Write a protein that binds this ligand. Sequence first.
Ligand SMILES: COc1cc2c(cc1OCCCC(=O)Nc1cc(C(=O)Nc3ccc4sc(C(=O)Nc5cn(C)c(C(=O)SC[C@@H](O)[C@H](O)CS)n5)cc4c3)n(C)c1)N=C[C@@H]1CCCN1C2=O
Ligand SMILES: CCOC(=O)c1nc(NC(=O)c2cc3cc(NC(=O)c4cc(NC(=O)CCCOc5cc6c(cc5OC)C(=O)N5CCC[C@H]5C=N6)cn4C)ccc3s2)cn1C
Length: 217
Amino acid sequence: GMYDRWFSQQELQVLPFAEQDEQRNQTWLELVGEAQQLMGERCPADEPRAIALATRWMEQLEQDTAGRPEFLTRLNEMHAAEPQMREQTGVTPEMIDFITRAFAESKLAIWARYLNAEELAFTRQHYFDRLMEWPALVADLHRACREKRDPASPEGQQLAQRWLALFQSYAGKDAQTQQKFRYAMEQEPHLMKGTWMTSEVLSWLQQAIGVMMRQAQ
Ligand SMILES: COc1cc2c(cc1OCCCC(=O)Nc1cc(C(=O)Nc3ccc4sc(C(=O)Nc5cn(C)c(C(=O)SC[C@@H](O)[C@H](O)CS)n5)cc4c3)n(C)c1)N=C[C@@H]1CCCN1C2=O
Ligand SMILES: CCOC(=O)c1nc(NC(=O)c2cc3cc(NC(=O)c4cc(NC(=O)CCCOc5cc6c(cc5OC)C(=O)N5CCC[C@H]5C=N6)cn4C)ccc3s2)cn1C
């Protein structure tokens, strides 16, 4: 079995995509149908329909991976490697790329109200630079939260420093710009949609960052 070569039996018990679910299949039929439509029209990634689709799409993926970021990586790799996956779902690499760009536009459209033109141009340019490293970090943040580790611990501060590096890769290294991203997150919860970042894990990360800022302040 395809799913058996890609996931452990313990993972297949927790993976919603493993379970039969007619509602979920109908939802994905509609998501893929709308993607094909918009791509057929050559709809730009910043069009309101593209932004709305990408948001719903990523929220659906968050549900169907049970909020486990490492299952997103696995599913992307399966789609790249397994012709049977592309047949089953109708999701093409072009489609994943379209959704990836529209999802970025959905964040940039919110940030545009909190950043100056220069900060937004930097973030638009550098958004994708280290994008692929986020799932592994979000996974480790999920583990640190569940294993109720101390944000102030050396291992907690290793996660805070890893977060800072990935964040600065798209935000830049200006302390004032970082506070604008923080303010945007506080004012616009919709920024967190499709990021695998639950309020519980964000709260833990916020504590770890708090410690990091005050040590060498
Ligand atoms: C030590 O503190 C406490 C201790 C105790 C406390 C409380 C405590 O709380 C007080 C601390 C509160 C505080 O001053 N905090 C803080 C914060 C900041 C700050 O700068 N935040 C920030 C900025 C930008 C982003 S941007 C962001 C973020 O996450 N971005 C992001 C996420 N993703 C996923 C991405 C991506 O691009 S990936 C995109 C997707 O498509 C992928 O697919 C993902 S899979 N970007 C976060 C932030 C945060 N500053 C400056 C300060 N109380 C309890 C305990 C009990 C005993 C005593 N205690 C305690 O000991
Ligand atoms: C870097 C970090 O990662 C990212 O940033 C990122 N990762 C992503 N990943 C994705 O987008 C992903 C999407 C999905 C979707 C799934 N979907 C499913 O499991 C699924 C779908 C379904 N679907 C169905 O029941 C509907 C019947 C099949 O429909 C068709 C079938 C159909 C074609 C067309 C079809 O419909 C129009 C076709 O023309 N065809 C196309 C060629 C073949 C021919 C025949 N087949 C069920 N399930 C269970 C699973 C995993 C992923 S991962 C996106 N971003 C932004």
